[PDB]
Amino acid sequence: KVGLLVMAYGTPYKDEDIERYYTDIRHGHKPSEEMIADLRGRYHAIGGLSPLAKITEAQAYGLEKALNDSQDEVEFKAYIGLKHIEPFIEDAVEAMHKDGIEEAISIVLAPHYSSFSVEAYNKRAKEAADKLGGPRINAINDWYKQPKFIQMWADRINETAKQIPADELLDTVLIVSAHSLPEKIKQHNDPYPNQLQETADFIFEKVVVPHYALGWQSEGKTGEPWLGPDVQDLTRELYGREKYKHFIYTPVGFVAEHLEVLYDNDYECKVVTDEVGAAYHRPPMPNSDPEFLEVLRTVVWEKYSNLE
Ligand SMILES: CC1=C(CCC(=O)O)c2cc3nc(cc4[nH]c(cc5[nH]c(cc1n2)c(C)c5CCC(=O)O)c(CCC(=O)O)c4C)C(CCC(=O)O)=C3C
Numbered sequence: 499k500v501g502l503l504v505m506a507y508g509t510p511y512k513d514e515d516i517e518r519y520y521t522d523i524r525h526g527h528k529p530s531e532e533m534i535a536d537l538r539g540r541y542h543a544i545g546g547l548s549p550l551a552k553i554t555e556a557q558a559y560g561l562e563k564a565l566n567d568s569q570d571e572v573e574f575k576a577y578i579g580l581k582h583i584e585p586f587i588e589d590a591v592e593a594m595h596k597d598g599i600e601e602a603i604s605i606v607l608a609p610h611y612s613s614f615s616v617e618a619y620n621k622r623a624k625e626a627a628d629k630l631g632g633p634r635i636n637a638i639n640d641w642y643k644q645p646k647f648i649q650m651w652a653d654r655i656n657e658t659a660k661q662i663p664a665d666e667l668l669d670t671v672l673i674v675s676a677h678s679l680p681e682k683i684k685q686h687n688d689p690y691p692n693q694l695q696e697t698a699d700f701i702f703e704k705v706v707v708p709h710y711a712l713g714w715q716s717e718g719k720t721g722e723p724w725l726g727p728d729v730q731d732l733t734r735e736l737y738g739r740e741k742y743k744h745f746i747y748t749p750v751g752f753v754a755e756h757l758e759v760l761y762d763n764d765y766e767c768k769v770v771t772d773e774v775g776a777a778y779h780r781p782p783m784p785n786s787d788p789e790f791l792e793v794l795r796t797v798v799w800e801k802y803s804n805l806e
């Protein structure tokens with residue numbers, strides 16, 4: 499078999515897990531009671547917990563099945579490795595090794611590369627495999643250039659746009675976003691900001707929406723500048739300059755409904771559109787839609803074919 503190491507951020511399974519999860523995010527430094535209360539309040543606002551654990555499972559095992567149903571050159575076996583709760587990246591590599599997996603392909607459920615995200619997933623996976631003696635991990639770094647990925651988002655955007663009155667489409671803007679990172683990554687030409695711009699450009703040329711902008715969301719609690727503009731601020735700025743009637747938010751750096759979409763878009767961006775008198779749109783996330791499982795199947799199968 500070939501191991502398929504499918505990686506993602508992780509989410510609390512239970513309300514009681516929030517403290518240890520947030521501590522892991524903060525590199526072992528326990529957050530304060532006020533920080534914990536803020537995060538717990540956001541989870542409460544979206545219904546109590548996030549759907550990300552179930553979606554991530556459906557993505558990983560749906561990918562495994564799409565691959566195995568489409569060819570008989572190899573058998574893939576999926577192992578889920580999460581960044582900040584069990585099963586951790588290291589636990590997934592240990593499981594492959596214990597099962598006798600000799601070779602693996604890895605994919606992060608985030609289509610863009612950065613030094614804070616995919617690089618860190620890959621370093622941890624490689625370091626765990628090195629200590630164990632295997633498996634050899636063949637990492638996919640990014641996959642936003644996949645045409646089926648771009649077309650999936652364009653199709654969702656066009657479906658939403660077709661329900662906007664034709665006389666208001668000229669007053670509609672597409673806001674393309676991803677998770678913000680510290681601005682300092684630009685100092686060393688990290689590819690992440692340019693990958694998001696390329697993604698926005700590729701999508702724009704396949705949709706009927708005539709206006710678009712790139713923003714960022716979910717910047718952390720630090721004392722340094724992060725990539726912007728923030729999507730809330732950008733919404734205000736664009737309404738100020740152009741008086742758009744419809745804002746369509748596609749946080750294409752993410753692949754699932756989770757806290758950073760359900761709260762940071764569907765609550766925080768809608769607060770702004772409500773304040774200025776515009777309509778809020780946020781198309782369905784890829785989740786485990788068959789189209790999205792086909793994107794991932796294409797990516798992994800191309801990777802496997804290029805290794806051989
Ligand atoms: C680049 C990136 C992605 C995208 C790529 C990938 O998918 O890996 C991502 C995804 C996610 N981030 C998530 C959650 C959180 N991220 C946080 C904090 C942070 N994220 C960061 C980066 C990223 N994060 C960074 C540099 C910090 C600051 C750390 C610090 O402060 O030193 C915090 C702490 C509180 C806060 O900052 O709001 C939380 C709760 C969830 C799960 C949501 C759920 O449970 O549904 C998901 C999918």
Ligand SMILES: [Ca+2]
Pocket residue numbers: 716717
């Ligand atoms: Ca925030």
